[PDB]
Structures are given as C-alpha cells and as structure tokens.
C-alpha cells in the first residue's frame, strides 16, 4: 500500500509530480503516481481505492490546475474526484504552489472548496532542496 | 568540473531539466544547473567556461525552446550562447524532446543550424525509466 497519492494535471503538472516522485522514494515514501502504479481492471474503482490507501494526498497546484473542476457538477473530473475522495477519507492534505493563483471558493463545486483550507508548500526552482525538505517534514 | 551541463528554458523546461538532473545525479553523474551550480562572479564568464568543462551538454527541447535564439543575431540569448559554445568545443549533445516542433534550419542563426543534425531522445512521460536509461546510454 503506498504511503503517499500525487494528483495533478498532465497538461500542466506532469513534470513535477514526476520530481516529487523521485525524490519521495529516495527517502523512503512508496509513491502512487498513475501512469507507473494504476494496474489492470476498471481504473474508476481502482484510482479511488489508491487514494484511500495513502496516508498522504500530495496535490500539484499549476497554474490552471483546478479549472476543469468548477461547473464540474457531476464529478466528472479526475481532480475533483481524487481531492472529493481525500477530503472525505480525512487524509493528510499537501498542497504543492507551482504558479497557482488561488480562486475564490466559491466557483468551485461544494464537495471540494475544503480543499483551500489546507496549508500551501510553495515550490522554489532556486531552493528545490529544502522545498523538497519541507515537504518531507509535512508527509505522515 | 561537472561531465554535464544542462542547458533549457526557465519558461517551459525547467522541471524537466530539474528532474534531468536528479536522475542523472543518481547515477553517479555530476551535472550543472545554473540556478544550484552557478556560483560567484562575472556569469558571461562562468558560464562559458562550465559548457566548455563538461563532456556532456544536454538540451532541453522543450515547446518552443529555440523562439529566443530566432533572430539574435547578435547571439545575446543564453540558449544560444550555450548551444554555440557546444558545438564550437565538440561536445557530445544530446537533446531532450518533449514537445518540441522541428524548424528548418533556414529560421536559425547559421552558427547554431549545426544543432539540428544531433540525435535526440523522446521524452515519454508513461516510460520514464526507459527514457533515464536511454540518455545514460547516449552519455560519455
Ligand atoms: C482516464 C485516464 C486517467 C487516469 C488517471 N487520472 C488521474 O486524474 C488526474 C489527471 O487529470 P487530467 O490532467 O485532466 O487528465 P485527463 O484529461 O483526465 O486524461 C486524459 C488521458 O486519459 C486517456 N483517455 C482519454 N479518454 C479516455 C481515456 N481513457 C479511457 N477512456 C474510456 C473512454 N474514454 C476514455 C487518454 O490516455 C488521455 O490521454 C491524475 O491525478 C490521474 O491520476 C486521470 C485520467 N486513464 C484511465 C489513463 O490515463 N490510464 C493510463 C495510465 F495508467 F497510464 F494512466
Ligand atoms: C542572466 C541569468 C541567466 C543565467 C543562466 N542562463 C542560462 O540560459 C538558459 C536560460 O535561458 P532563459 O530562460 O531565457 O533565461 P532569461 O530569460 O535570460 O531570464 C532568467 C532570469 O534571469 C534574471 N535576469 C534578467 N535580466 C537580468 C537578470 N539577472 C541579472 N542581470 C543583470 C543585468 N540584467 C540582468 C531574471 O531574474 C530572469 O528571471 C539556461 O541554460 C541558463 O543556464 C540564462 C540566464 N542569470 C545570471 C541568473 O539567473 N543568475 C541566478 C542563477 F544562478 F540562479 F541562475
């Protein structure tokens, strides 16, 4: 069972939930990333059972990252599933800031505006070390 | 002296050039980035001299990469700057591809065209680890 989910946005975040990974696993964390550890059979059941799984929801907020959530009433949307899922399971919240600017609550879907309340980890590209530290010190 | 220097876009390549560098380090590779290895003094200079003491340059391609170096002519853009200084000292180049549209040579400045005739290795985002080792393999 992994110790840590990463959720993000391929077209914007792919290359640093792929970082996040590595540097995770160099110190020990088993890491969730979909495109190397989401196996066979139906992938709805199988992304939600990962997320309950990790202790630790790591969330890669590029710019734009939750733009597909807002009017996504239906839950349609693989962010807003995964961070639905988290917040409702009570997991150790990790925003990542990479660009993002923070929206009001208010045009996002109900079920998922909780997630603004966790603290943020701003990602440095001149301090990566000790971002990567800091993001050490928050994982349970 | 550092056997790679890794030469990108602040813009558009900067975690993949981040996550480059990890994994290279990661098998025993010393490498140069400017925002961790660039130290103290005149940057024209030690810059130059740090493409200049590596065996190894590695070229982020990221979309849109070489937009700055069309018309410079003048060759003040850094891509540009470290690309010529590369193929001047018969450096073993190898790009990186992700995302990147091929130009023809034409749009180019004449002493950097000579870039576009290096074999290149396509960044897969769903095979990472064969992608790692593939550049290890191209890697002197
Ligand atoms: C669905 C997709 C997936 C997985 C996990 N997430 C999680 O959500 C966040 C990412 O969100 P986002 O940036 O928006 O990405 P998205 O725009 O949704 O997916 C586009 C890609 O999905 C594929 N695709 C497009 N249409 C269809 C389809 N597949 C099955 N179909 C049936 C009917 N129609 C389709 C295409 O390959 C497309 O390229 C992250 O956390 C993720 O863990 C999101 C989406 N999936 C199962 C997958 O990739 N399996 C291979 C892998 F195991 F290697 F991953
Ligand atoms: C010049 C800059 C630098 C270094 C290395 N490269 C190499 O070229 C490729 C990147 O190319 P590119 O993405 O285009 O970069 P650029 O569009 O020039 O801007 C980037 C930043 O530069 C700052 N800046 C903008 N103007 C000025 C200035 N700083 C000092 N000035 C004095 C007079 N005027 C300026 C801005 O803060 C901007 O954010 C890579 O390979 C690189 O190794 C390119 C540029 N530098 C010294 C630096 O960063 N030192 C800190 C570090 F050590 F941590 F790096």
Redesign the interface.
């Known amino acids: 069972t992994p110790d840590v989910f990463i959720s993000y946005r ?1 077209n914007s975040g ?3 939930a ?2 996040l990974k ?2 995770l696993q ?1 110190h020990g964390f088993s890491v969730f990333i979909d ?2 550890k989401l196996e066979a059979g139906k992938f709805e059941d199988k992304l939600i059972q990962s997320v309950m799984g990790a202790r630790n929801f790591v969330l890669v907020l590029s710019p734009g990252a939750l733009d597909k959530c807002m009017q996504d009433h239906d839950c349609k949307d693989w962010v807003h599933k995964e961070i639905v899922t988290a917040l409702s399971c009570g997991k150790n919240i990790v925003p990542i800031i990479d660009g993002f600017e923070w929206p009001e609550p208010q045009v996002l879907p109900e079920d998922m505006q909780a997630v603004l309340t966790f603290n943020g980890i701003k990602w440095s ?2 301090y ?1 070390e000790a971002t990567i530290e800091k993001i050490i010190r928050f994982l349970q």
Do not use: A, G, W
Request: hydrophobic share 35%; proline share 0%.
């Open positions: 391929r792919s290359q640093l792929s970082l590595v540097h160099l495109v190397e590209h001149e990566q």
